[PDB]
Symmetry: C3
Subunit: 218 residues, 3 copies
C-alpha cells in the first residue's frame, strides 16, 4: 500500500446461534427476549465497531459484546482471531442474520484505515459517522443519531492529531482512548454537527501524516 491508500478490512469468521444457552445469555447480559446471537471476527477493530453500530441502524439488534485483541492483527496467533470479536443479539434469528449482513457488508466495503506513509507502517482511521446507531452513541454518552468523528492512530500521532482536530472545528471530545488500546493505538470520539465532525476528520488525517513525515523534529 502507498501513502493515502485505503487498507481493506476483512471478516474472518461468522456464526449465527438461533437459540443461545441461558447460562450464556446471562453472562452476556442479553436484553429481554434476545435469544439469538451472531458472532463475528475481523482483522480491524475500529472498522468493526463502526460496522456493529451500523447494524443497529439496519436491523432489530443490539451490540452485546465488542472487544479488541492484544497486539492487533499483525500479532494474531491463530487463523480466525484477527483483532476483534463482535456479538449482536436480537429477538429472532432473522433479525440477527440481517444485522450480521449489515456488519459484514460494512466491514468489507464502507470504512477503512488509511496508510500515512510509503511503506505501509503507519495508518489512521478518520471516519465521519453522519448518524450514530445505538452502540457508538451509548459509547460516546450522546443521544442516538448524533454525528461522530471516529479518530484513531498510533500512540503519539493520535495524541498530537486529536488535539489538532479539537482545534479545527466546533467539536467536543466525548470518548478518549488514551494509548495503548489493546492493539496499541489511541485516539477518541468527537461530536458536533456533521460538517464540524468532517472538518475534524480532515484535520486529524493531515496531522497524522505530518507526524509520519517528520517524527523527531519538534
Amino acid at each position: 500500500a502507498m501513502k493515502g491508500d485505503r487498507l481493506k478490512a476483512n471478516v474472518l469468521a461468522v456464526r449465527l446461534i438461533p437459540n443461545v444457552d441461558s447460562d450464556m445469555a446471562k453472562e452476556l447480559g442479553l436484553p429481554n427476549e434476545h435469544r439469538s446471537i451472531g458472532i463475528l471476527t475481523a482483522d480491524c477493530d475500529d472498522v468493526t465497531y463502526t460496522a456493529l453500530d451500523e447494524a443497529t441502524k439496519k436491523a432489530v439488534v443490539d451490540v452485546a459484546y465488542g472487544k479488541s485483541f492484544y497486539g492487533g492483527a499483525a500479532n494474531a496467533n491463530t487463523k480466525l482471531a484477527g483483532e476483534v470479536i463482535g456479538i449482536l443479539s436480537g429477538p429472532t434469528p432473522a433479525e440477527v442474520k440481517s444485522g450480521l449482513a449489515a456488519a459484514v457488508d460494512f466491514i468489507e466495503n464502507e470504512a477503512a484505515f488509511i496508510s500515512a506513509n510509503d511503506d505501509d507502517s503507519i495508518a489512521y482511521f478518520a471516519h465521519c459517522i453522519s448518524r450514530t446507531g445505538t452502540y457508538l452513541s451509548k459509547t460516546a454518552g450522546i443521544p442516538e443519531g448524533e454525528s461522530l468523528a471516529y479518530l484513531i492512530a498510533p500512540p503519539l500521532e493520535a495524541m498530537y492529531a486529536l488535539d489538532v482536530a479539537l482545534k479545527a472545528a466546533d467539536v467536543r471530545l466525548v470518548a478518549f482512548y488514551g494509548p495503548p488500546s489493546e492493539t496499541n493505538f489511541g485516539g477518541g470520539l468527537l461530536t458536533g454537527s456533521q460538517s464540524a465532525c468532517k472538518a475534524a476528520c480532515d484535520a486529524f488525517a493531515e496531522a497524522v501524516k505530518f507526524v509520519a513525515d517528520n517524527p523527531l523534529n519538534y
Copy 2:
C-alpha cells in the same frame, strides 16, 4: 496435523526455600509458607490445570498464575513462554514435590489439540475428574468436583461453549470472554464426570466444524 496433540513445554523452574518477607506479603503468602516454587511454560491453560494437579499431590497452594500478552508465539524473551505459576508451601520438600507434579503434568498429561492441517487453530477440551484447591476456587465450586476446561480462539470458543452447554447436564461456572491475555476464550463447566466428558467432546467437535467452514452462517 488435524487432531494432533500439541505438547506443552516447561521453560524454567526455580525453588526459593525461604522467600523474603516483603515478597511474601506481595504474593499474599500465608504466614506458614516461606518456600515457593516458580515455573514458566509455553501453554497457559495446560499450566493452570497442572498447578491445580499439584495441590492434590503435595502440601502446596497456588500463590500466583498469570498469562502473558500475545501468547507464546509472541514471546519476546527466551524463558517467558506465555504463563508463570508460583506454588507456595511450608517446606522446600513439599514445594519440590508440587513442582515435580506440575512439570510432569505440563509435559505429559494435558495438551491443546490442532483443529486443522496447518496447525493454525487449536483448542483445549480437558476433563478434570477431581479438582484440586486452585480450579475449584476459581470456579466457585467445592474442592473435588469435576470440570470441563474448554478453551479455543475467540469466535470458535463462544460458538463451541454454547454447543457444549447444550450437549450435557453441565453449568457454566467460569466465563472467559475473549480475549484472554493470549487472545483465546472459553470457560469452565461443571457437572458429573461423565457430563463434563460429554461437554469436552462436543466442544472439540464444534471447534473443528468452525475451522472447516469459518464463513458459513
Copy 3:
C-alpha cells in the same frame, strides 16, 4: 549483542503542544496551570520512565502520562509506537521543551537494559537512581530525592532475582511489578541508601544471569 552488552534505547517520535485543548487537558488530568505538553515514544519503557523522572529535576514539568505497550517493542505493529509513550506537562512551552531535552538525552545515553546471554534473548534492567524526581518517588510512595533500585527482568528471572536482591542489602520493596507488565516483564522498585540500592542492583543482575545459565536446574 553479546552477554553483558548494554542495549541502547531509542526515541522514535517527539511532539510539543504549546496550548493543549481543554477537553484533553481534563482527560489527561493536568493541573489547571499546565496547558503545554510534550509527548514522546521510545523503544524501551523502563528506561523511559527513569528518563521522565529525571526530566522533572531541571525543568518545571510534571510527568502527566506514562504507559507501556502490549507485547513490547519486538511486537510493535507500527513504525513510531515502540513500547512506551510519555507525556510531560508544564506551564509554558519553554519549560516543557527543557524537560523534553532532558528526557531524550537520558533515554539515549544514561540508562539501558543489559543482555544476559549470548543470544540476546534475555535482558534485564538494574538501574540505581541516586536521587528520584517527582515521578518515581510518587510511584514508589517515597519522598522526592530518595534513592531507588529499578529492577526489571523477564517473568521468572525477575521474581527469583528480586528475592536475591532483597537479601543482598538493607533495602525495602516499595513497588512490586508482578509479571506480566504490558511488555511481559516483571520486577520492582527497591529503596534504601544509595549504596544499598547499588548493592541490590549488582545482586539482581548476577541472579538474572544465573537463571539464564541454569533455567531448569532447580
